[PDB]
Design a binder for this molecule. Structure first.
Ligand SMILES: N[C@@H](CCC(=O)N[C@@H](CS[C@H]1C([N+](=O)[O-])=C[C@@H]([N+](=O)[O-])C=C1[N+](=O)[O-])C(=O)NCC(=O)O)C(=O)O
Ligand SMILES: N[C@@H](CCC(=O)N[C@@H](CS[C@H]1C([N+](=O)[O-])=C[C@@H]([N+](=O)[O-])C=C1[N+](=O)[O-])C(=O)NCC(=O)O)C(=O)O
Lengths: 218, 218
């Protein structure tokens, strides 16, 4: 049995999971759900199935792995990471992992909040004002380490990468002030299975968000 | 030396952390920060200090424990839980923990979203329409277990409790359709250190949210 990863036919919250899945070399298939166009943005393809998957808190994404039925993107992430020693070894490694796990989710919500907000264009200047600061925190937090946890790559590297990439897309010249972060993107995309996957026809970098979006809905 | 827990002089995101601190018998003080009144809810008392605490991602709440400086409520929670074997033993225990860790965070966000929304009064009927459903998921998820992880109490029990309590305070009869959840509230408040603490002058059940709020700002 391969694992099933369920999600909308977009990037969204599955990106880190897909990347992690590939990096770990895990047998799996995606169950992609399509969303209708305006003004309903019909979701019945997912809603017809939402409550019949034995999920405890029906949501997307979800991962199904035989008996284990998982929701909550970070939960899927640590569940997979655990099978391959990537949830962090030492105590220091774990702290950093717990922080970044939630820190990235926050910066992600924040991006997604405006990109789904009809006011998108007016909010953008302020969000761009503050971006440099957000990225500085990551840069300083990474410091001279090869990975965010420390010396070993871990699943939060996938979360941090996704967030950084997203912004390089949103604001091309948004990483230049931080060599080490650009080095991080190199290392990560330089990883063999990551590279191979990025070249494959499975890669799915866009849409970034669902159709409801004002930006990256395309 | 005692640990410092920093947060607004409210309940908010610290409630689970306070409860957990007491239950584990942890040695700690609070650094409480006050917020100004309308219409600029000044936050300089925290802002004057925000960047000088050696925090990696300055935020509230934070926990300071000698060399370890932590942010992100869930990270503080697991960090403490680990010192006392409460982040989950088995694999099944961990999955459940990871899920609820994020699941509660979501239902909390959701509540906090409308209670901070000026439109509070119009949004309320719709939120109460779904008020139950959400609770049903918890009830079914708990099932016949004494705790949400399984047979051992763990730190998510604190998160789930807070969320259930918050709603009972918002929708009294919002827990009648689910005996087992009321039993959970019994067990939890029935815990000795919990009970003692709830009677102490340290107990801080309100305000629920910051002053900016339309509900539970009082
Ligand atoms: N915290 C959960 C996220 C759960 C969630 O909201 N999932 C959304 C898509 S995320 C989506 C999003 N995005 O596309 O990146 C981000 C957006 N946002 O504000 O950041 C919220 C989303 N949304 O529209 O629901 C969903 O479709 N749930 C199925 C259901 O409820 O039936 C997790 O990490 O798994
Ligand atoms: N993900 C972090 C969230 C940290 C956070 O958002 N803290 C807010 C207060 S939470 C607050 C809230 N509440 O009080 O319960 C809930 C609300 N919400 O929508 O859920 C968001 C809040 N807010 O006002 O930002 C803050 O004051 N940050 C300090 C800073 O950034 O300088 C965590 O879990 O610790």
């Amino acid at each position: 049995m391969p694992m099933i990863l369920g999600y909308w036919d977009i990037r969204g919250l599955a990106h880190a999971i897909r990347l992690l899945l590939e990096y770990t070399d895990s047998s799996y298939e995606e169950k992609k759900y399509t969303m209708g166009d305006a003004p309903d943005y019909d979701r019945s393809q997912w809603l017809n199935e939402k409550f019949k998957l034995g999920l405890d808190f029906p949501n997307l994404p979800y991962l199904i792995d035989g008996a284990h039925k998982i929701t909550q993107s970070n939960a899927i992430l640590c569940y997979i990471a655990r099978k391959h020693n990537l949830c962090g070894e030492t105590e220091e490694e774990k702290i950093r992992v717990d922080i970044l796990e939630n820190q990235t989710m926050d910066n992600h919500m924040q991006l997604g909040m405006i990109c789904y907000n009809p006011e998108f264009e007016k909010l953008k200047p302020k969000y761009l004002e503050e971006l440099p600061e957000k990225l500085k925190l990551y840069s300083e937090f990474l410091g001279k380490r090869p990975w965010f946890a420390g010396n070993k790559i871990t699943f939060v590297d996938f979360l941090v990468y996704d967030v950084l990439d997203l912004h390089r897309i949103f604001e091309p010249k948004c990483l230049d002030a931080f060599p080490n972060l650009k080095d991080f993107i190199s290392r990560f995309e330089g990883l063999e299975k990551i590279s191979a996957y990025m070249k494959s026809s499975r890669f799915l970098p866009r849409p970034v968000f669902s159709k409801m979006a004002v930006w990256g809905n395309k």
